[PDB]
Symmetry: D2
Subunit: 108 residues, 4 copies
């Protein structure tokens, strides 16, 4: 079957969120995943949808899954591993936001 409908979801969701030139050039690819629905690969600059889940997802479900992944991509940052001497990309979460807040209160 065709994945023409999938590249259209990706593109109009990329535009909606207003992704910067670097994060905006991301392709979509159907591949079997061991333990997730979707997965972002920053080295490949692609998002993978689980080959086995996609045939059962509704249009609304796919649109939500993708917009949710890409939102976390949009507000993610790069950090230095130091020990591994490697660049590491970290996605945001409420625990990270709240721990940092309290941490900053304790520097005072």
């Amino acid at each position: 079957k065709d994945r023409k409908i999938l590249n259209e979801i990706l593109s109009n969701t990329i535009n909606e969120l207003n992704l910067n030139d670097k994060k905006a050039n991301i392709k979509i690819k159907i591949k079997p995943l061991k333990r997730k629905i979707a997965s972002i690969s920053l080295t490949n600059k692609t998002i993978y949808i689980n080959k086995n889940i996609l045939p059962y997802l509704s249009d609304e479900e796919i649109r939500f899954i993708l917009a949710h992944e890409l939102l976390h991509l949009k507000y993610g940052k790069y950090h230095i591993n130091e020990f591994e001497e490697e660049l590491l990309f970290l996605f945001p979460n409420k625990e990270a936001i709240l721990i940092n807040l309290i941490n900053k209160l304790h520097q005072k």
Copy 2:
């Protein structure tokens, strides 16, 4: 202090996601919250930001928090409680999406 900057985040994030007329008319209000950063009240048609957290959040943090809440609002649905004889609004999550999939496989 002024919350003029907060209503501007809300409005341009509402437009970005393309919220329908009903979900789009949502106001923002600073109020103390017992156990959350933000909280949507569908009867009041307002989103509350924790009075105590907001002074420490960055512009990027607020933009992400709000866009995350509103995304879950956008793809949420109403369901009948039956027992309580009341309307109930349910937000999406990966467990709900995957349980329904398997459930649908078992009707066959």
Copy 3:
């Protein structure tokens, strides 16, 4: 088929965690669930496992699912709804723990 093996998991997991007399008297019941694997009903004092998921779960999976639910039951508390004039049971989470911390810093 028999659910004799299921009541044995429940009982030895209840004992392991050391649940108090009130929370300890909880029965287990196989029932179809709309959007979850397991679900605790405090009025019925029972835990429901999704009829459609259970045939595919391993022994280790069931043991983990149950121990995870019962742990959140063990450290949960009752709170007054005030508006609804009803008792409400709230399960713990990292957001609830961290929001309360910061809230307590702002009373000073």
Copy 4:
């Protein structure tokens, strides 16, 4: 101050869950953490509690945090990275359990 009360929580929580000889020999250490409350290090065989959070946590909070981490440790497994030619430890979650279920339905 003393961390004698912390090693007592760890030990009786290790015994309660019935951790196997390998996972059971785990020490506890107070250290500042960038974005988490607690963190398990399998190479160091230690659990770290955030230096800045711990002074504000209640006895019940600490007991729950630790029992929650150690439960996910207990039902975690090792997997081969293949590409990195390294051993990787993976903690359980409902998405991993449900994705695997559907994946197994598609091998048929």
